[PDB]
Design an enzyme around this catalytic site. Sequence first.
Site, PDB file in Angstrom:
ATOM      1  N   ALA A 219      -4.291  71.278  23.283  1.00  0.00           N
ATOM      2  CA  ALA A 219      -3.986  71.901  22.858  1.00  0.00           C
ATOM      3  C   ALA A 219      -2.848  73.241  23.203  1.00  0.00           C
ATOM      4  CB  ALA A 219      -5.026  72.234  21.904  1.00  0.00           C
TER       5      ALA A 219
ATOM      6  N   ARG B  15      10.463  74.620  22.809  1.00  0.00           N
ATOM      7  CA  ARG B  15      12.138  73.486  22.325  1.00  0.00           C
ATOM      8  C   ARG B  15      12.510  74.179  20.860  1.00  0.00           C
ATOM      9  NH1 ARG B  15       9.314  69.559  24.681  1.00  0.00           N
ATOM     10  NH2 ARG B  15       7.743  68.904  22.659  1.00  0.00           N
TER      11      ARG B  15
ATOM     12  N   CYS C 267     -10.244  63.044  30.070  1.00  0.00           N
ATOM     13  CA  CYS C 267      -9.979  61.490  29.663  1.00  0.00           C
ATOM     14  C   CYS C 267     -10.697  60.467  30.765  1.00  0.00           C
ATOM     15  CB  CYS C 267      -9.131  60.702  28.697  1.00  0.00           C
ATOM     16  SG  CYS C 267      -9.214  62.026  27.199  1.00  0.00           S
TER      17      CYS C 267
ATOM     18  N   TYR D 212      -1.486  36.875  12.152  1.00  0.00           N
ATOM     19  CA  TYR D 212      -1.722  35.879  12.773  1.00  0.00           C
ATOM     20  C   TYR D 212      -1.417  34.825  13.596  1.00  0.00           C
ATOM     21  CZ  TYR D 212      -4.249  31.409  12.622  1.00  0.00           C
ATOM     22  OH  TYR D 212      -4.623  30.371  13.071  1.00  0.00           O
TER      23      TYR D 212
ATOM     24  N   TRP E 266      -7.717  34.738   8.401  1.00  0.00           N
ATOM     25  CA  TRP E 266      -8.615  35.510   7.433  1.00  0.00           C
ATOM     26  C   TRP E 266      -8.956  36.859   9.430  1.00  0.00           C
ATOM     27  CZ3 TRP E 266      -7.423  36.698   2.851  1.00  0.00           C
ATOM     28  CH2 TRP E 266      -7.244  35.647   1.722  1.00  0.00           C
TER      29      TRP E 266
HETATM   30  C1  FAD Z   1     -15.196  63.342  30.079  1.00  0.00           C
HETATM   31  C2  FAD Z   1     -14.685  63.271  29.237  1.00  0.00           C
HETATM   32  C3  FAD Z   1     -14.170  62.071  28.969  1.00  0.00           C
HETATM   33  C4  FAD Z   1     -12.950  62.215  27.707  1.00  0.00           C
HETATM   34  N1  FAD Z   1     -12.735  61.039  27.055  1.00  0.00           N
HETATM   35  C5  FAD Z   1     -11.708  61.134  26.268  1.00  0.00           C
HETATM   36  C6  FAD Z   1     -10.910  60.025  25.849  1.00  0.00           C
HETATM   37  O1  FAD Z   1     -10.770  59.004  26.045  1.00  0.00           O
HETATM   38  N2  FAD Z   1     -10.251  60.307  24.196  1.00  0.00           N
HETATM   39  C7  FAD Z   1      -9.898  61.172  23.921  1.00  0.00           C
HETATM   40  O2  FAD Z   1      -9.031  60.960  22.915  1.00  0.00           O
HETATM   41  N3  FAD Z   1     -10.307  61.938  24.234  1.00  0.00           N
HETATM   42  C8  FAD Z   1     -11.804  62.914  24.904  1.00  0.00           C
HETATM   43  N4  FAD Z   1     -11.880  63.620  25.689  1.00  0.00           N
HETATM   44  C9  FAD Z   1     -11.924  65.617  25.218  1.00  0.00           C
HETATM   45  C10 FAD Z   1     -10.462  65.321  25.878  1.00  0.00           C
HETATM   46  O3  FAD Z   1     -11.217  65.016  27.220  1.00  0.00           O
HETATM   47  C11 FAD Z   1     -10.742  66.925  25.193  1.00  0.00           C
HETATM   48  O4  FAD Z   1     -11.576  66.417  23.333  1.00  0.00           O
HETATM   49  C12 FAD Z   1      -9.606  67.635  24.886  1.00  0.00           C
HETATM   50  O5  FAD Z   1      -8.990  68.094  26.442  1.00  0.00           O
HETATM   51  C13 FAD Z   1      -9.880  68.721  24.568  1.00  0.00           C
HETATM   52  O6  FAD Z   1      -8.233  69.801  24.800  1.00  0.00           O
HETATM   53  P1  FAD Z   1      -8.378  71.481  24.704  1.00  0.00           P
HETATM   54  O7  FAD Z   1      -7.071  72.000  24.635  1.00  0.00           O
HETATM   55  O8  FAD Z   1      -8.914  71.711  23.153  1.00  0.00           O
HETATM   56  O9  FAD Z   1      -9.354  71.707  25.201  1.00  0.00           O
HETATM   57  P2  FAD Z   1      -9.461  71.366  27.026  1.00  0.00           P
HETATM   58  O10 FAD Z   1      -8.796  70.121  27.265  1.00  0.00           O
HETATM   59  O11 FAD Z   1     -10.607  72.049  27.281  1.00  0.00           O
HETATM   60  O12 FAD Z   1      -8.774  72.860  27.341  1.00  0.00           O
HETATM   61  C14 FAD Z   1      -9.237  74.134  27.405  1.00  0.00           C
HETATM   62  C15 FAD Z   1      -9.023  75.065  28.364  1.00  0.00           C
HETATM   63  O13 FAD Z   1      -8.639  76.609  27.991  1.00  0.00           O
HETATM   64  C16 FAD Z   1      -9.263  77.390  29.195  1.00  0.00           C
HETATM   65  N5  FAD Z   1     -10.444  78.337  28.813  1.00  0.00           N
HETATM   66  C17 FAD Z   1     -11.226  77.982  28.134  1.00  0.00           C
HETATM   67  N6  FAD Z   1     -11.598  79.545  28.370  1.00  0.00           N
HETATM   68  C18 FAD Z   1     -11.317  80.623  28.528  1.00  0.00           C
HETATM   69  C19 FAD Z   1     -10.741  81.965  28.433  1.00  0.00           C
HETATM   70  N7  FAD Z   1     -12.146  82.406  28.058  1.00  0.00           N
HETATM   71  N8  FAD Z   1      -9.544  82.411  29.289  1.00  0.00           N
HETATM   72  C20 FAD Z   1      -8.628  81.412  29.314  1.00  0.00           C
HETATM   73  N9  FAD Z   1      -8.799  80.390  29.361  1.00  0.00           N
HETATM   74  C21 FAD Z   1      -9.768  79.721  29.143  1.00  0.00           C
HETATM   75  C22 FAD Z   1     -10.065  76.063  29.918  1.00  0.00           C
HETATM   76  O14 FAD Z   1     -10.079  76.011  31.473  1.00  0.00           O
HETATM   77  C23 FAD Z   1      -9.364  74.716  30.154  1.00  0.00           C
HETATM   78  O15 FAD Z   1      -8.609  74.709  30.707  1.00  0.00           O
HETATM   79  C24 FAD Z   1     -12.611  63.610  27.396  1.00  0.00           C
HETATM   80  C25 FAD Z   1     -13.229  64.342  27.690  1.00  0.00           C
HETATM   81  C26 FAD Z   1     -13.952  64.607  28.821  1.00  0.00           C
HETATM   82  C27 FAD Z   1     -14.925  65.602  29.185  1.00  0.00           C
HETATM   83  C1  FAD Z   2       2.895  24.376  15.246  1.00  0.00           C
HETATM   84  C2  FAD Z   2       3.031  25.344  13.771  1.00  0.00           C
HETATM   85  C3  FAD Z   2       2.433  26.358  14.548  1.00  0.00           C
HETATM   86  C4  FAD Z   2       1.772  27.159  12.679  1.00  0.00           C
HETATM   87  N1  FAD Z   2       1.833  28.203  13.725  1.00  0.00           N
HETATM   88  C5  FAD Z   2       1.331  29.603  12.953  1.00  0.00           C
HETATM   89  C6  FAD Z   2       0.803  30.370  13.265  1.00  0.00           C
HETATM   90  O1  FAD Z   2       0.476  31.401  14.391  1.00  0.00           O
HETATM   91  N2  FAD Z   2       0.606  32.019  11.857  1.00  0.00           N
HETATM   92  C7  FAD Z   2       0.540  31.349  11.102  1.00  0.00           C
HETATM   93  O2  FAD Z   2       0.510  32.315  10.122  1.00  0.00           O
HETATM   94  N3  FAD Z   2       0.878  30.048  10.482  1.00  0.00           N
HETATM   95  C8  FAD Z   2       1.661  29.110  11.561  1.00  0.00           C
HETATM   96  N4  FAD Z   2       2.011  27.384  10.181  1.00  0.00           N
HETATM   97  C9  FAD Z   2       2.143  27.383   9.381  1.00  0.00           C
HETATM   98  C10 FAD Z   2       1.017  27.646   8.956  1.00  0.00           C
HETATM   99  O3  FAD Z   2       0.737  26.307   9.405  1.00  0.00           O
HETATM  100  C11 FAD Z   2       1.674  27.169   7.507  1.00  0.00           C
HETATM  101  O4  FAD Z   2       2.336  28.508   6.535  1.00  0.00           O
HETATM  102  C12 FAD Z   2       0.508  26.345   6.589  1.00  0.00           C
HETATM  103  O5  FAD Z   2      -0.282  25.548   7.076  1.00  0.00           O
HETATM  104  C13 FAD Z   2       0.768  26.497   5.020  1.00  0.00           C
HETATM  105  O6  FAD Z   2      -0.529  25.832   4.109  1.00  0.00           O
HETATM  106  P1  FAD Z   2       0.323  25.616   2.288  1.00  0.00           P
HETATM  107  O7  FAD Z   2      -1.447  25.058   1.790  1.00  0.00           O
HETATM  108  O8  FAD Z   2       1.329  25.786   1.999  1.00  0.00           O
HETATM  109  O9  FAD Z   2       0.912  23.927   3.404  1.00  0.00           O
HETATM  110  P2  FAD Z   2       0.487  22.890   3.950  1.00  0.00           P
HETATM  111  O10 FAD Z   2      -0.492  23.045   5.094  1.00  0.00           O
HETATM  112  O11 FAD Z   2       1.631  22.293   4.936  1.00  0.00           O
HETATM  113  O12 FAD Z   2      -0.511  22.043   3.686  1.00  0.00           O
HETATM  114  C14 FAD Z   2       0.572  21.346   2.249  1.00  0.00           C
HETATM  115  C15 FAD Z   2      -0.205  20.052   2.109  1.00  0.00           C
HETATM  116  O13 FAD Z   2       0.513  19.122   1.115  1.00  0.00           O
HETATM  117  C16 FAD Z   2       0.423  17.429   1.181  1.00  0.00           C
HETATM  118  N5  FAD Z   2       1.880  16.681   0.492  1.00  0.00           N
HETATM  119  C17 FAD Z   2       3.202  17.323   0.875  1.00  0.00           C
HETATM  120  N6  FAD Z   2       3.336  16.845  -0.778  1.00  0.00           N
HETATM  121  C18 FAD Z   2       2.725  15.885  -1.111  1.00  0.00           C
HETATM  122  C19 FAD Z   2       2.574  15.069  -2.505  1.00  0.00           C
HETATM  123  N7  FAD Z   2       4.343  14.864  -3.217  1.00  0.00           N
HETATM  124  N8  FAD Z   2       1.567  14.329  -3.065  1.00  0.00           N
HETATM  125  C20 FAD Z   2       0.017  15.026  -2.208  1.00  0.00           C
HETATM  126  N9  FAD Z   2       0.351  15.581  -0.848  1.00  0.00           N
HETATM  127  C21 FAD Z   2       1.591  16.279  -0.697  1.00  0.00           C
HETATM  128  C22 FAD Z   2       0.434  17.420   2.984  1.00  0.00           C
HETATM  129  O14 FAD Z   2       0.702  16.121   3.021  1.00  0.00           O
HETATM  130  C23 FAD Z   2       0.148  18.615   3.297  1.00  0.00           C
HETATM  131  O15 FAD Z   2      -1.194  18.771   3.189  1.00  0.00           O
HETATM  132  C24 FAD Z   2       2.379  27.063  11.925  1.00  0.00           C
HETATM  133  C25 FAD Z   2       3.075  25.394  11.817  1.00  0.00           C
HETATM  134  C26 FAD Z   2       2.856  25.317  12.350  1.00  0.00           C
HETATM  135  C27 FAD Z   2       3.427  23.595  12.243  1.00  0.00           C
END
Ligand code: FAD
Ligand code: FAD
Lengths: 444, 444
Positions: free
Chosen positions: A11, A21, A42, A425, A433
């Site tokens: 902070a 800056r 952290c 997706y 979904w």
């Molecule tokens: C083990 C651990 C894991 C954590 N993991 C996460 C995490 O995963 N994700 C996350 O978001 N946060 C995490 N935190 C929290 C994060 O480290 C703190 O929220 C962040 O450091 C807070 O910043 P700050 O500047 O408010 O306080 P601090 O970083 O505590 O700094 C305050 C400073 O003020 C100084 N000070 C205090 N009193 C005085 C005084 N009277 N005179 C002069 N100086 C003083 C201290 O020496 C200290 O350096 C973790 C904390 C710990 C301890």
């Molecule tokens: C290789 C590949 C990878 C893909 N990867 C992704 C992905 O990673 N993420 C993503 O979001 N989407 C992906 N897609 C797209 C996704 O598959 C399509 O957008 C989705 O299937 C479309 O749904 P739909 O019901 O509109 O059409 P379709 O799934 O194509 O179904 C339409 C159906 O209508 C039928 N039909 C057509 N004409 C007629 C007719 N005249 N009479 C009766 N039936 C008919 C067909 O037989 C078909 O079964 C991918 C597509 C392919 C080909």
Amino acid sequence: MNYVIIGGDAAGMSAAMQIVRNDENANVVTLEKGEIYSYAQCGLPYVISGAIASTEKLIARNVKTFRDKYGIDAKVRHEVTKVDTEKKIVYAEHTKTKDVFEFSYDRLLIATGVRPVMPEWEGRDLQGVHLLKTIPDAERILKTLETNKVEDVTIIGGGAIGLEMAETFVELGKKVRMIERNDHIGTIYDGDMAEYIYKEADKHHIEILTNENVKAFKGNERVEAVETDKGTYKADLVLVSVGVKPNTDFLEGTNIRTNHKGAIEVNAYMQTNVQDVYAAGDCATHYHVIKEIHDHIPIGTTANKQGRLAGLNMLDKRRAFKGTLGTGIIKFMNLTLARTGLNEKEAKGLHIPYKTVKVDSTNMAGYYPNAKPLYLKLLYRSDTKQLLGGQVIGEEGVDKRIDVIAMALFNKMSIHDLEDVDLSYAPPYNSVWDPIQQAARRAE
Amino acid sequence: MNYVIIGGDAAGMSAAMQIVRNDENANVVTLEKGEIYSYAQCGLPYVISGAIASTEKLIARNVKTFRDKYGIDAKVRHEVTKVDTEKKIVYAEHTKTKDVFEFSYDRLLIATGVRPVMPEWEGRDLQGVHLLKTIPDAERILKTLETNKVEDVTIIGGGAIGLEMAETFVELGKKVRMIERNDHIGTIYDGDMAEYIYKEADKHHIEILTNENVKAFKGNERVEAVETDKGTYKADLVLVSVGVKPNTDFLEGTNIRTNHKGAIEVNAYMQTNVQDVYAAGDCATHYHVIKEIHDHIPIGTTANKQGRLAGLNMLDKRRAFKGTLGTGIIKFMNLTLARTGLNEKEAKGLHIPYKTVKVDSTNMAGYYPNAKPLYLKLLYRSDTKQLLGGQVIGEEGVDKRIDVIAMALFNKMSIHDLEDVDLSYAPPYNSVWDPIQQAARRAE
Ligand SMILES: Cc1cc2nc3c(=O)[nH]c(=O)nc-3n(C[C@H](O)[C@H](O)[C@H](O)COP(=O)(O)OP(=O)(O)OC[C@H]3O[C@@H](n4cnc5c(N)ncnc54)[C@H](O)[C@@H]3O)c2cc1C
Ligand SMILES: Cc1cc2nc3c(=O)[nH]c(=O)nc-3n(C[C@H](O)[C@H](O)[C@H](O)COP(=O)(O)OP(=O)(O)OC[C@H]3O[C@@H](n4cnc5c(N)ncnc54)[C@H](O)[C@@H]3O)c2cc1C
Ligand SMILES: *SCCNC(=O)CCNC(=O)[C@H](O)C(C)(C)COP(=O)(O)OP(=O)(O)OC[C@H]1O[C@@H](n2cnc3c(N)ncnc32)[C@H](O)[C@@H]1OP(=O)(O)O
Ligand SMILES: *SCCNC(=O)CCNC(=O)[C@H](O)C(C)(C)COP(=O)(O)OP(=O)(O)OC[C@H]1O[C@@H](n2cnc3c(N)ncnc32)[C@H](O)[C@@H]1OP(=O)(O)O
């Protein structure tokens, strides 16, 4: 011209960079108690697990960079002990020499974060009993592991840190126990979603103790056991992670308004009630988009956002803080755990009429290889159908789903509008979904 | 009471299901040309590569289920040749016997999809020259592979199918060439983003030929070569993936309005200009959220959404289609390719004044192990800063970023508003500022 910032991390320095800056004339002084600026708290559990090479890697920007490149008078070892808001003077004590220095300001920012709480237990001070907050904390945990022979580790408390560190200690080959407080049940995850967490812990032989209260830590000079109201269990290392407190103590005597837990109240513009005094990050309150109230969800994303905004507003570049969503994400063993907005405990507490939908689905098309289960729950207003929150748990695609939910919440979307979004997706990424949309369809 | 649906796949059967669930009296007749209902065309490339066991795995619901469980009179081998919209009669030919049947309707839905286009090239009909659309198509491709010695495969045309099948043929151990069309340069990806695709193909030894025109397929009974205006290259199997045509031919003489390419124009409610005649999916036009025009972007997500909406609207459960964003995602070798909203060619084509931001970033914190590059580009309006589109390319976290971008486009967000969203972060998932947010910050 004279800007003072208390706290040299997320902070505080996000603010500093905005000022530097956008005001070439600015005199920026930053006061940091410790010796390390702008580092990633952290990353600490991942340094300890060995996944990251060293704590050095966590440093985003040097005090030398702040001074040399950006011209910020960045102080280390300067602990602010009081502020005079009338005289506009900040009083800092050097942590080693104990000399007192004055710093006058035109505008002040408090960015002092929170500190981990150590309850007044017998055994508090035993060697091998640890808090985790700073780089020195991590080094001390590593030092305990390196010297002392550690086989059993007990974690007190859960939450993000407790869970991440349970993984860290398991990965270090330790036998891990977690002891959980009743005061934090349902605060993050609903009971039904938390079940997935208990199951995953059990699977990896992390013993979790529920409704059990810590009594004392036992040992000689080093810790060797944890005593509760139900037993005494061997532990060669204890990590306490039971709650945090805003570092705002030193402001007693000022008129700066604070919530019950001591977090500094800020308006839309990061301003306290005291003229020219701002606050940001973990030490400040966080306007909640859904709750519509000033909450406290101390997290690093919010801290950077709030810090950046504090700096901008201190420059009179007026910009409002839009709020937190209570978003949070955790890696726990093989699971990813994500939540945002309101859970049931939060909804109930606010007396917002809500319903839920839960879906046991997959991250992608069921016919595609390595498709994984995905557990997704949404809350929505029973009258307007406004989406209120979500919880997502699974192995893959959890962060994707929570970010989409977060986006929906930010935009005040109705749950059924999700059905209409052209989300991506292909078989390796999703179903035709998305699970969010499938749950949306189940909603009334 | 009498509902008739032409097309037994995504759009047609999504409609049928809506009708059956929301009208107990309803007599639903579905007319399908082939013998397979409700199958995932999207999984086809993954069956051919061996990743999915068989085509049977792609069937989501069969004709027996539609008939026995849902009471739909689902017909197979019925090709519709004529619709009389005045008499409200649909004429179908049995594909085997050639006998003519007629079906009376109160409400009609056309859901006939599109067909892959085979240009009138010499050698069109040689064995080993293939289109890919249906399960029988895939089986035919597998048959060419099983019974012949295929070493060289040539693909005509890029696009999603072309790239996916290029992967499939590389994975089957073949030497792959693709010959791309000039008409489709910049239609999906901008030139600078497409560079990443060319690089990845080259890396995997996929020969890509640019600005080269096919003139003939050569061979005796089977293909052995592809001839172009610039050479003749060996090919044992040719896949033609150069475009699609709406299956709407048969409607000539009905006054049902159609765009230039033959896609049936639909209003908000999936209605054509002809009373009681509806259309949905690939055979219909697709209102575009950003273009604000009726476009044609035939994919399965849109098809299901439109089919579902057509069924509802056929029941007079009035609900508007919100539109497509032009979202699309492709797996290509080690890369994931995602795009949504407008690219530069589309923006220019509409004369919408736009600027771009491009960021070379990572999917997560740089210090965290296996953090991967992430290439992200955004378009936004010069004047209002309204977000217009995005392209994301990288190995991981591409789908997450495109879905966030899609959500932003759906909600007509300004680019800088993305900075304010409480997106999730922990080191294994993101950086403390998401790449989208970092790009947003670079925007004017
Ligand atoms: C083990 C651990 C894991 C954590 N993991 C996460 C995490 O995963 N994700 C996350 O978001 N946060 C995490 N935190 C929290 C994060 O480290 C703190 O929220 C962040 O450091 C807070 O910043 P700050 O500047 O408010 O306080 P601090 O970083 O505590 O700094 C305050 C400073 O003020 C100084 N000070 C205090 N009193 C005085 C005084 N009277 N005179 C002069 N100086 C003083 C201290 O020496 C200290 O350096 C973790 C904390 C710990 C301890
Ligand atoms: C290789 C590949 C990878 C893909 N990867 C992704 C992905 O990673 N993420 C993503 O979001 N989407 C992906 N897609 C797209 C996704 O598959 C399509 O957008 C989705 O299937 C479309 O749904 P739909 O019901 O509109 O059409 P379709 O799934 O194509 O179904 C339409 C159906 O209508 C039928 N039909 C057509 N004409 C007629 C007719 N005249 N009479 C009766 N039936 C008919 C067909 O037989 C078909 O079964 C991918 C597509 C392919 C080909
Ligand atoms: S546990 C997680 C919480 N912890 C931390 O975040 C670690 C401590 N972090 C910090 O203290 C801050 O996050 C720091 C490191 C100080 C961030 O400082 P900056 O705000 O200076 O960050 P950047 O250096 O990334 O600068 C951002 C501004 O610069 C513009 N910009 C970046 N890159 C470019 C390029 N290539 N071209 C043009 N402009 C660029 C950004 O637009 C941004 O501008 P703003 O005006 O700040 O939006
Ligand atoms: S290439 C990809 C494109 N291809 C395809 O999609 C393949 C072909 N697909 C199709 O033909 C359709 O997608 C089919 C398979 C017919 C889907 O039909 P349905 O629309 O019936 O889908 P569902 O069977 O999932 O049913 C959806 C409705 O049922 C409600 N629902 C499901 N499950 C539950 C539970 N457990 N509890 C309560 N309700 C449940 C959904 O809410 C949904 O309701 P709607 O009213 O339709 O929103």
